[PDB]
Design a binder for this molecule. Structure first.
Ligand SMILES: Nc1ccn([C@H]2C[C@H](O)[C@@H](COP(=O)(O)OP(=O)(O)OP(=O)(O)O)O2)c(=O)n1
Ligand SMILES: [Ca+2]
Ligand SMILES: [Ca+2]
Ligand SMILES: [Ca+2]
Ligand SMILES: [Ca+2]
Ligand SMILES: [Ca+2]
Ligand SMILES: [Ca+2]
Length: 900
DNA sequence: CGGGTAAGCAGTCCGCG
DNA sequence: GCGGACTGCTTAC
């Protein structure tokens, strides 16, 4: 097999590399890598190295990496560009792996761990590490084993060994229901004292040194706690054994409002799963506790116990250890589903970076572009300093607030990367500027043609047409990978819909789920067999279809995120290829494209309908248009349709056969107008929306920009067994809105769109009547908590104090005295509730850490004093009044003459 | 901590005769 | 009360 790196580090003048050799074995080596860097040189000097602008360069080979670094400094003191890859480990990987990396994940050691630390005096600060580590579960992907390190004797209690037999048993048997599929994979090791546990853990770690290190909050808690605890007990050199090169550094993580400390373990690639999830999941959660995320992703129930976690070890050590094991398995289960580790490995190896660099799009792209250019013997410019400057982004059309009955939407495929490809936007393809007309003149095709030579953007930039730039070339490769996974994702989705349909008629038989590849559209034979299957089999197939779809979604959406990241990296000062001319060429072209095509679709449809000046395009945002299809439906007449699916087919056919070719011609003309390199504006139909045939549903509504709801029958070629709501921006979509309120508002919208005004007033009247019975958590608002200290004036609100911060200060006073009570963590999320006047808390609201029950000390009072009236009006009535006046209907029945 | 801009709504503060 | 300036937070793209 072809070798591949596992980790790479620079330590002084050595590269330290862990790798898989040609025989599949893990090795380590130290290499005294001699970097090269580059200077411009005279024309009449024979060279094969050229900067990206075609100017000749001489290569300077250095005795060691420290000499290259010092040289870089001296070149600045002189005032001359020191060209080339200044991150020497990236050049090493480029030199050592000069081919497309074929990796084998079964050879990569992936470690998932979680620790327990009993603490009587509140939260155990990792930087202090003053309490014993009393449990470690460490899963190893190569052995496929959970190694459990269990402390039996502690200053906080002596306990009995954990029992695997009780662990296996049902919760109803007094057991812990550790899942049976992992019971045989546990290797349990009890310890008589902490020193021995840790000494064994380090010996184990040495034998099985993680390549990828993950788990939940490992970077901010587990790793620094373990590192600091071992440091305190044994000294630094023993603690540095967590690094296979014995090198670590304390790294300061700075945000807008403060900082924290993490430990960098050289020769390990730490991918904290909480950070993986935040980057790759495309959710925004009320809480990031593992219990909350586990429940959301897997639908497994909260790990439940009596009393505080601080007393769990002594009161119930058995459950304590079982929950530590289960917590590690939960992360694995989320990964089996979401496939973020897999994704990280793909992108890291593709870019030829340290795997943990996948968190940085600037670093990922710096390495992709470096490797690409290195291939042609080209030399990358030096990074330069830039002042941060604002620049313009997308156009968004102001919709007329209203109900909209029949809606068809269209949207550019990979808008910004397509613009980059079409215009040929790249650092080294800039050819000059032209005299710009106001944008409006390009939109209406009255401005002078920008160039008869170069490919243009309406921001005034021109680009070469003879050759593709390195940015379009490399962005195209990732785009193609994206398109492939999206194909599998959509197939799995359409397959899901076939299964749902079939489920309306399950057969009464005992059978097995079919062995099929869900990434591919179900053939006729598979369709036939599906119609003969039981509900049990069908459900299992649905689950598998949805897993395949989730796998496709992770792969496609984060490749989209990567390529879109490049368009934005052109506008970040830290990017080697930062250039506001290119960042703006992209965003300005986009604004033009949207408005240009709005004009064309309008002209086209007015033509088809024999009208003039009618606005068919009601809305659009960035690269999308929403076309009113009322007139199209009416021209055939609702009477001619057999059912909802009949008009949906009609519109689908109209969009594909009439609208899309009209759209394509309009864009080809725009391409010629801008003299672009390649026509790449592909605007496919997204949504077909409307009310169910013969109902009183309103089908859709807009309240404003980025605020709308649509009843959707077909999305990108997926025909739904059941209509689906596409709701954007509204309170149902916000993590700040109470869960029960999201759910109630969603149902009001479903009723408005599918059933009508009368159904809506029915549901409202009932929700208003019963809502006070809802669990307090389900009706709490959610907010991030920044700058708690800034607004804290002796425990009371300072001037301009935010409502949610006020809530926290109210909380802090109510629990003052107790180091046992959970503290709100700065920068994390809180639940917020209003309090009725003259409550014992002395203020109008209270907030507490999100994803948790509020402590028992105050819970009773909170419940008694909760202001259901305020809460109702703010979270439910206000947005609902927003929706319904927009849609021009009433949530309460107005008096009529029939009342008499 | 980690590519970008546009834009909505909640809330404070204070004006608005 | 509303609305504008401003902060804070959170979306859509
Ligand atoms: N996080 C994001 C999301 C979007 N965009 C920009 C770039 C996108 O190209 C454009 C339109 O967004 P879409 O959600 O329509 O995404 P794409 O058009 O890129 O992909 P798709 O093919 O899924 O439409 O907005 C961005 O810069 N950053
Ligand atoms: Ca725990
Ligand atoms: Ca798009
Ligand atoms: Ca599409
Ligand atoms: Ca059947
Ligand atoms: Ca879009
Ligand atoms: Ca306001």
């Amino acid at each position: 097999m072809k070798e591949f790196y596992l980790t790479v580090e620079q330590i002084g003048d050595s590269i330290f590399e862990r790798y898989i050799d040609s025989n599949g074995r893990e090795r380590t080596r130290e290499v005294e890598y001699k970097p090269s860097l580059f200077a411009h040189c005279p024309e009449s000097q024979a060279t094969k190295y050229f900067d990206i602008y075609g100017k000749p360069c001489t290569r300077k080979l250095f005795a060691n990496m420290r000499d290259a670094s010092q040289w870089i400094k001296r070149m600045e003191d002189i005032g001359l560009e020191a060209l080339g890859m200044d991150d020497f480990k990236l050049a090493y990987l480029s030199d050592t792996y000069n081919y497309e990396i074929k990796y084998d994940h079964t050879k990569i050691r992936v470690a998932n761990f979680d620790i327990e630390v009993t603490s009587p005096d509140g939260f155990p600060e990792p930087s202090q590490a003053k309490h014993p580590i009393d449990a470690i579960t460490h899963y190893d992907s190569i052995d496929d084993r959970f190694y459990v390190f269990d402390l039996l004797n502690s200053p906080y209690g002596n306990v009995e060994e954990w029992s695997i037999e009780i662990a296996a048993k049902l919760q109803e048997q007094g057991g812990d229901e550790v899942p049976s599929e992992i019971i045989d994979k546990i290797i349990y090791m009890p310890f008589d004292n902490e020193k021995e546990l840790l000494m064994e853990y380090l010996n184990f770690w040495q034998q099985k040194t993680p390549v990828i290190l993950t788990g939940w909050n490992v970077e901010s808690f587990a790793i620094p706690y373990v590192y600091n605890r071992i440091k305190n007990i044994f000294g630094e050199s023993t603690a540095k054994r967590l690094s296979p090169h014995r090198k670590t550094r304390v790294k300061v993580i700075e945000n807008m409002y403060g900082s924290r400390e993490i430990i960098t373990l050289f020769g390990i690639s730490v991918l904290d799963y909480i950070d993986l999830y935040k980057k790759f999941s495309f959710t925004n959660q009320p809480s990031y506790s593992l219990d909350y995320i586990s429940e959301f992703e897997l639908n497994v129930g909260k790990l439940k116990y009596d009393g505080p976690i601080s007393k769990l070890r002594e009161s119930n050590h058995q459950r304590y250890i079982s929950y530590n094991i289960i917590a590690v398995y939960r992360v694995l289960q989320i990964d089996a589903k979401r496939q973020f580790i897999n994704l990280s490995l793909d992108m890291g190896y593709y870019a030829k970076i340290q795997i943990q660099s996948v968190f940085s799009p600037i670093k990922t792209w710096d390495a992709i572009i470096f490797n690409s250019l290195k291939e042609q013997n080209k030399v990358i410019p030096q990074g330069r300093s830039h002042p941060v400057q604002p620049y313009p982004g997308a156009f968004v059309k102001e919709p007329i607030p209203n109900r909209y009955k029949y809606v068809m939407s269209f949207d550019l495929t990979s808008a910004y990367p397509s613009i980059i490809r079409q215009v040929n936007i790249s650092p080294e393809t800039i050819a000059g500027t032209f005299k710009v007309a106001p944008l409006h003149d390009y939109i209406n095709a009255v401005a002078e043609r920008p160039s008869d030579v170069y490919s243009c953007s309406p921001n005034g930039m021109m680009y070469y047409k003879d050759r593709d730039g390195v940015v379009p070339t490399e962005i195209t490769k990732v785009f193609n990978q994206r398109k492939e996974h999206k194909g599998y994702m959509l197939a799995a989705q359409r397959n899901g819909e076939i299964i749902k349909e079939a489920l309306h008629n399950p057969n009464l038989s005992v059978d097995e789920p079919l062995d099929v590849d869900y990434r591919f559209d179900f053939s006729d034979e598979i369709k036939e067999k599906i119609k003969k299957l039981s509900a049990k089999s069908l459900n299992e197939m649905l689950f598998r279809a949805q897993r395949t779809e989730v796998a496709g979604m992770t792969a496609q959406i984060n490749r989209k995120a990567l390529i879109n990241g490049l368009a934005g990296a052109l506008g970040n000062v830290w990017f080697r290829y930062y250039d506001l001319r290119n960042a703006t060429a992209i965003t300005t072209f986009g604004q033009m494209a949207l408005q240009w095509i709005e004009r064309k679709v309008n002209e086209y449809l007015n033509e088809v309908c024999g009208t003039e000046g009618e606005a068919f395009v009601l809305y659009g945002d960035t690269d999308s248009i929403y076309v009113s299809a009322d007139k199209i439906i009416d021209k055939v007449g609702e009477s001619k349709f057999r059912d909802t699916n009949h008009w949906v087919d009609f519109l689908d056919k109209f969009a594909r056969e009439r609208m899309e070719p009209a759209i394509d011609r309009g864009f080809r003309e725009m391409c010629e107008y801008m003299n672009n390199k390649q026509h790449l504006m592909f605007m496919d139909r997204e949504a077909i929306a409307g009310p169910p045939l013969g109902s009183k549903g309103i089908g859709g509504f807009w309240t404003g920009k980025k605020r709308y709801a649509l009843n959707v029958w077909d999305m990108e070629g997926t025909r739904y067994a059941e209509p689906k709501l596409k709701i954007m921006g509204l309170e149902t979509q916000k993590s700040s809105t109470p869960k029960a309120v999201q759910k109630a508002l969603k149902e009001c919208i479903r009723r408005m769109l599918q059933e009508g005004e009368e159904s809506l007033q029915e549901y409202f009247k009932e929700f208003e009547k019963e809502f006070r019975q809802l669990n307090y958590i389900s009706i709490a608002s959610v907010s991030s908590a920044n700058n708690i200290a800034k607004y804290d004036v002796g425990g009371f609100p300072g001037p301009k104090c935010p409502f949610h911060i006020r809530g926290i200060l109210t909380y802090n006073r109510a629990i003052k005295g107790n180091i046992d009570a959970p503290q709100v963590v700065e920068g994390e999320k809180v639940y917020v509730l209003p309090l009725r006047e003259g409550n014992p808390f002395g203020d109008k609201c209270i907030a507490w850490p999100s994803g948790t029950e509020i402590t028992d000390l105050i819970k009773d009072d909170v419940l008694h004093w909760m202001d259901y009236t305020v809460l109702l009006e703010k979270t439910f009535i206000k947005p609902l009044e927003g929706f319904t006046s927009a849609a021009k209907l009433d949530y309460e029945k107005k008096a009529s003459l029939f009342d008499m």
